[PDB]
Design a protein around this motif. Sequence first.
Motif, PDB file in Angstrom:
ATOM      1  N   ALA A   1     -22.814  24.222  -2.197  1.00 43.24           N
ATOM      2  CA  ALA A   1     -22.250  25.566  -2.162  1.00 43.24           C
ATOM      3  C   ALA A   1     -20.759  25.573  -1.838  1.00 43.24           C
ATOM      4  O   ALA A   1     -20.269  24.728  -1.084  1.00 43.24           O
ATOM      5  CB  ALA A   1     -23.015  26.429  -1.160  1.00 43.24           C
ATOM      6  N   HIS A   2     -20.042  26.540  -2.402  1.00 46.34           N
ATOM      7  CA  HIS A   2     -18.619  26.694  -2.130  1.00 46.34           C
ATOM      8  C   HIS A   2     -18.155  28.136  -2.304  1.00 46.34           C
ATOM      9  O   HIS A   2     -16.986  28.389  -2.604  1.00 46.34           O
ATOM     10  CB  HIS A   2     -17.788  25.752  -3.007  1.00 46.34           C
ATOM     11  CG  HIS A   2     -17.872  26.051  -4.471  1.00 46.34           C
ATOM     12  ND1 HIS A   2     -16.981  26.883  -5.111  1.00 46.34           N
ATOM     13  CD2 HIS A   2     -18.741  25.626  -5.418  1.00 46.34           C
ATOM     14  CE1 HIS A   2     -17.298  26.960  -6.394  1.00 46.34           C
ATOM     15  NE2 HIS A   2     -18.361  26.207  -6.603  1.00 46.34           N
ATOM     16  N   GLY A   3     -19.077  29.078  -2.121  1.00 51.01           N
ATOM     17  CA  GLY A   3     -18.733  30.491  -2.111  1.00 51.01           C
ATOM     18  C   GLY A   3     -19.031  31.254  -3.387  1.00 51.01           C
ATOM     19  O   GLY A   3     -18.738  32.445  -3.481  1.00 51.01           O
TER      20      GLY A   3
ATOM     21  N   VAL B   1     -21.733  24.867  -8.225  1.00 49.30           N
ATOM     22  CA  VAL B   1     -21.680  23.727  -7.316  1.00 49.30           C
ATOM     23  C   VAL B   1     -20.336  23.019  -7.449  1.00 49.30           C
ATOM     24  O   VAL B   1     -19.670  23.131  -8.480  1.00 49.30           O
ATOM     25  CB  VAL B   1     -22.823  22.721  -7.582  1.00 49.30           C
ATOM     26  CG1 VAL B   1     -24.148  23.275  -7.076  1.00 49.30           C
ATOM     27  CG2 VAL B   1     -22.901  22.370  -9.065  1.00 49.30           C
ATOM     28  N   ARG B   2     -19.937  22.298  -6.405  1.00 45.87           N
ATOM     29  CA  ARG B   2     -18.660  21.590  -6.404  1.00 45.87           C
ATOM     30  C   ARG B   2     -18.632  20.490  -7.462  1.00 45.87           C
ATOM     31  O   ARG B   2     -19.680  20.032  -7.911  1.00 45.87           O
ATOM     32  CB  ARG B   2     -18.386  20.974  -5.029  1.00 45.87           C
ATOM     33  CG  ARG B   2     -18.306  21.967  -3.885  1.00 45.87           C
ATOM     34  CD  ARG B   2     -17.848  21.278  -2.605  1.00 45.87           C
ATOM     35  NE  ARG B   2     -17.913  22.170  -1.452  1.00 45.87           N
ATOM     36  CZ  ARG B   2     -16.932  22.986  -1.081  1.00 45.87           C
ATOM     37  NH1 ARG B   2     -15.801  23.026  -1.773  1.00 45.87           N
ATOM     38  NH2 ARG B   2     -17.083  23.762  -0.017  1.00 45.87           N
ATOM     39  N   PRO B   3     -17.423  20.061  -7.861  1.00 48.37           N
ATOM     40  CA  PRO B   3     -17.267  18.916  -8.767  1.00 48.37           C
ATOM     41  C   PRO B   3     -17.917  17.667  -8.181  1.00 48.37           C
ATOM     42  O   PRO B   3     -17.845  17.445  -6.973  1.00 48.37           O
ATOM     43  CB  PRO B   3     -15.747  18.737  -8.841  1.00 48.37           C
ATOM     44  CG  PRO B   3     -15.196  20.092  -8.551  1.00 48.37           C
ATOM     45  CD  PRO B   3     -16.129  20.681  -7.527  1.00 48.37           C
ATOM     46  N   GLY B   4     -18.550  16.865  -9.030  1.00 48.38           N
ATOM     47  CA  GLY B   4     -19.235  15.667  -8.578  1.00 48.38           C
ATOM     48  C   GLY B   4     -20.696  15.921  -8.256  1.00 48.38           C
ATOM     49  O   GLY B   4     -21.475  14.984  -8.079  1.00 48.38           O
ATOM     50  N   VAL B   5     -21.071  17.194  -8.182  1.00 50.00           N
ATOM     51  CA  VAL B   5     -22.450  17.569  -7.896  1.00 50.00           C
ATOM     52  C   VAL B   5     -23.210  17.875  -9.184  1.00 50.00           C
ATOM     53  O   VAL B   5     -22.767  18.692  -9.994  1.00 50.00           O
ATOM     54  CB  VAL B   5     -22.519  18.792  -6.959  1.00 50.00           C
ATOM     55  CG1 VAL B   5     -23.965  19.188  -6.700  1.00 50.00           C
ATOM     56  CG2 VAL B   5     -21.800  18.497  -5.652  1.00 50.00           C
TER      57      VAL B   5
ATOM     58  N   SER C   1     -20.385  18.795 -18.187  1.00 51.98           N
ATOM     59  CA  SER C   1     -20.708  17.568 -17.470  1.00 51.98           C
ATOM     60  C   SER C   1     -20.798  17.843 -15.971  1.00 51.98           C
ATOM     61  O   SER C   1     -21.048  16.936 -15.175  1.00 51.98           O
ATOM     62  CB  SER C   1     -19.644  16.502 -17.742  1.00 51.98           C
ATOM     63  OG  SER C   1     -18.346  16.995 -17.441  1.00 51.98           O
ATOM     64  N   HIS C   2     -20.594  19.103 -15.598  1.00 53.44           N
ATOM     65  CA  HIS C   2     -20.579  19.507 -14.197  1.00 53.44           C
ATOM     66  C   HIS C   2     -21.211  20.885 -14.021  1.00 53.44           C
ATOM     67  O   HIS C   2     -21.739  21.462 -14.974  1.00 53.44           O
ATOM     68  CB  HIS C   2     -19.139  19.534 -13.682  1.00 53.44           C
ATOM     69  CG  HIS C   2     -18.254  20.481 -14.430  1.00 53.44           C
ATOM     70  ND1 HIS C   2     -18.181  21.825 -14.132  1.00 53.44           N
ATOM     71  CD2 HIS C   2     -17.417  20.284 -15.478  1.00 53.44           C
ATOM     72  CE1 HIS C   2     -17.332  22.413 -14.955  1.00 53.44           C
ATOM     73  NE2 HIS C   2     -16.855  21.500 -15.782  1.00 53.44           N
ATOM     74  N   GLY C   3     -21.144  21.411 -12.801  1.00 45.15           N
ATOM     75  CA  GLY C   3     -21.681  22.728 -12.507  1.00 45.15           C
ATOM     76  C   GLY C   3     -20.701  23.591 -11.736  1.00 45.15           C
ATOM     77  O   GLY C   3     -21.101  24.477 -10.984  1.00 45.15           O
ATOM     78  N   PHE C   4     -19.412  23.328 -11.933  1.00 46.94           N
ATOM     79  CA  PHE C   4     -18.344  24.044 -11.237  1.00 46.94           C
ATOM     80  C   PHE C   4     -17.919  25.272 -12.041  1.00 46.94           C
ATOM     81  O   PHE C   4     -17.422  25.146 -13.159  1.00 46.94           O
ATOM     82  CB  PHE C   4     -17.159  23.100 -11.025  1.00 46.94           C
ATOM     83  CG  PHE C   4     -16.128  23.611 -10.061  1.00 46.94           C
ATOM     84  CD1 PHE C   4     -16.483  23.994  -8.779  1.00 46.94           C
ATOM     85  CD2 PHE C   4     -14.794  23.671 -10.426  1.00 46.94           C
ATOM     86  CE1 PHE C   4     -15.528  24.449  -7.886  1.00 46.94           C
ATOM     87  CE2 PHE C   4     -13.836  24.122  -9.543  1.00 46.94           C
ATOM     88  CZ  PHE C   4     -14.202  24.511  -8.269  1.00 46.94           C
TER      89      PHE C   4
END
Length: 219
Positions: free
Chosen positions: A69-71, A76-80, A103-106
């Motif tokens: 989590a990041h608000g 989700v944050r990079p790398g997650v 390739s991410h979820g940011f």
Amino acid sequence: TQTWQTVLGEEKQEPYFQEILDFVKKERKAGKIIYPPQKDIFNALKLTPYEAIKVVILGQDPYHGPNQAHGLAFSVRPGVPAPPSLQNIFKELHADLGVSIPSHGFLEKWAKQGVLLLNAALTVEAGKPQSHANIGWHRFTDKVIESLNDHPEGIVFLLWGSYAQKKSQLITNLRHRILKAPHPSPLSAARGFLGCRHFSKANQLLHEMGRGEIDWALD
């Protein structure tokens, strides 16, 4: 002239507001791990100014795992690695608009596009789902939704799941469009999220209101 500071100015005055913030603080002092970090609690509002809002997507609570989590709702944050629900969201997005699976979820790029990614609860204790669902956040986030009733422009709401759909009663402004669908979780009892094509519909609606579409592409 209309900002989160002005439209939420009165609600901010409510003693319960500081008390929520105080509670979370004392919990952290008690050694408990709470997500997201304190400075990220209101990132959804930070990354999507009141007057920039075009689309609203509701979530329930922040992820309860490390570095997730990041608000933002679902993001989700990079790398997650993107969690199941977010993964299914990408699946629908790909099928709907042909957008490549990230390739991410940011999802900050969505927020900057005018997508308000709002959870009902803004904090959660590590490893404990919904652990902060009944501490009062809902009072405040309900008011965030209600504050949109006075928005000059028409907004598109994407309500996924029973919980999020309940909030529709808070949306009384007829200029706004409400789009409903089952929860994106591939485990949710009710199928139907796949095929609702909310992302293309959202852009069609925004276009018809001359607001400009959302670039859902991530990279």
